[PDB]
């Protein structure tokens, strides 16, 4: 959802400042940034101070859709941060409840759950291993036979996340029987699907020798072979790099 | 540390959210992502408007407070997710950042090893992006600074990039780096060597290529030595770290 700003803002004048050549203007439009994003960062730690985290990880057991959905956003958000905001919304015990949500009848509230579990694997190697522990990698396989594209779009960038971990969560990924999915996904008609399978398996392939030759094994080479000539340039561009390092 | 002020609707919010009654749980839900979105929205409109670029530029500016300004906004956004450390990737930063390493002022020096941690944070395509940018050299160069100040800042950014995936934890061993991690565990600072077996670790969690290489330094041996520590916690981390290597 794109928005635009509102017309009293002062931020293209402050913008002004830093590009021009005075230094008193120069000063006072780093220090009025500098407290946009201090106040900014505060509103958002204030948020956990207060104990929120906790309490909205109960919310995810809520009878109530509404409930449930928004109480989702906010954690969602939260682990879209950096590490230690993450590390804040694994402490408050999401995981657990997030990966239970991968059995919502709601595609909705799945898709949210997804995108929430994505957020928390685009931290450190341990923050992913919370996540493989929480058991989140059979229901993330299962959920790449789906009929829903939406829903098999964001099940896979979680997975790609994972596999951007050490070479032991990218193990766990290829025992949670993730590969013959994945190249199966090489034939997708959608585009952007074969996009991120590639990617995925292109962070396989940055581990050991172990996890190449996993690859090898669910004949992933003949696939990026004969499809390093698809319609598409970008997609030869990355099966490349894709086909290349697994060497 | 500081206080939230005293008119702060978030304690009754919180207990709204505990309660039984719905009503009272959604409009606090509803309250507490309106605050989350906001925060977020006034971090966003900042790298919209366009300024990372001019920060990065400000950089080399000869005022003192205008660079070190600039230099903490720049660090700040580079401490959220993957999307805002990108923006300041983007922004042409890392060049300016290495280049901040090797300065004559000791706090400037110390916000620019901060800043490149926070980079090196990120994942993978980012923390080589450092490495690209040629960070490790003056890193480890920073290893026995005689500032212990600074020489604790230099760590966590190593920690960090060695953090990554296997190709960039190669990247610190190549330019020769365990000698002095490995050095920096016999060292009076109980803070200190505690994040140098964090780094170690983090470079354990790598191939046997990378395991073989922290062998070769002399790691071993001064890592069973550690059970013989006054403190408890680190006789932990250095078993956690010692059998990583199965
Ligand atoms: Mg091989
Ligand atoms: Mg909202």
Same mark, same amino acid.
């Given at each position: 959802?794109?928005?635009?700003?509102?017309? *009293?803002?002062?931020?293209?004048?402050?913008?002004?400042?830093?590009? #021009? =050549?005075?230094?008193? &203007?120069?000063?006072?439009?780093?220090?009025?940034?500098?407290?946009?994003? #201090?106040? *900014?960062? !505060?509103?958002?730690?204030?948020?956990? =101070?207060?104990?929120?985290?906790?309490?909205?990880? %109960?919310?995810?057991?809520?009878?109530?859709?509404?409930?449930?959905?928004?109480?989702?956003?906010?954690?969602?958000?939260?682990?879209? $941060? $950096?590490? &230690?905001?993450?590390?804040?919304?694994?402490?408050?015990?999401?995981?657990?409840?997030?990966?239970?949500?991968?059995?919502?009848?709601?595609?909705?509230?799945?898709?949210?759950?997804?995108?929430?579990?994505?957020?928390?694997?685009?931290?450190?190697?341990?923050?992913?291993?919370?996540?493989?522990?929480?058991?989140?990698?059979?229901?993330?396989?299962?959920?790449?036979? #789906?009929?829903?594209?939406?829903?098999?779009?964001?099940?896979?960038?979680?997975?790609?996340?994972?596999?951007?971990?050490?070479? !032991?969560?990218?193990?766990?990924?290829? =025992?949670? *029987?993730?590969?013959?999915?994945?190249?199966?996904?090489? #034939?997708?008609?959608?585009? %952007?699907?074969?996009?991120?399978?590639?990617?995925?398996?292109?962070?396989?392939?940055? *581990?050991?020798?172990?996890?190449?030759?996993?690859?090898?094994?669910?004949?992933?080479?003949?696939?990026?072979?004969?499809?390093?000539?698809?319609?598409?340039?970008?997609?030869?561009?990355?099966?490349?790099?894709?086909? &290349?390092?697994?060497?």
């Amino acid at each position: 959802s794109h928005h635009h700003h509102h017309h *009293g803002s002062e931020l293209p004048q402050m913008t002004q400042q830093l590009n #021009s =050549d005075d230094m008193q &203007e120069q000063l006072s439009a780093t220090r009025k940034f500098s407290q946009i994003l #201090s106040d *900014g960062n !505060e509103q958002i730690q204030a948020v956990i =101070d207060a104990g929120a985290l906790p309490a909205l990880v %109960q919310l995810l057991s809520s009878p109530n859709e509404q409930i449930l959905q928004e109480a989702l956003w906010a954690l969602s958000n939260i682990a879209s $941060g $950096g590490n &230690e905001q993450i590390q804040a919304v694994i402490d408050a015990g999401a995981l657990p409840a997030l990966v239970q949500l991968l059995s919502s009848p709601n595609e909705q509230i799945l898709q949210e759950a997804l995108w929430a579990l994505s957020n928390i694997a685009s931290g450190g190697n341990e923050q992913i291993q919370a996540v493989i522990d929480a058991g989140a990698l059979p229901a993330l396989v299962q959920l790449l036979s #789906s009929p829903n594209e939406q829903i098999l779009q964001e099940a896979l960038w979680a997975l790609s996340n994972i596999a951007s971990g050490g070479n !032991e969560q990218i193990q766990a990924v290829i =025992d949670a *029987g993730a590969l013959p999915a994945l190249v199966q996904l090489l #034939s997708s008609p959608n585009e %952007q699907i074969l996009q991120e399978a590639l990617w995925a398996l292109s962070n396989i392939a940055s *581990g050991g020798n172990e996890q190449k030759q996993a690859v090898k094994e669910a004949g992933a080479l003949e696939k990026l072979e004969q499809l390093q000539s698809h319609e598409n340039e970008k997609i030869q561009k990355e099966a490349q790099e894709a086909l &290349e390092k697994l060497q």
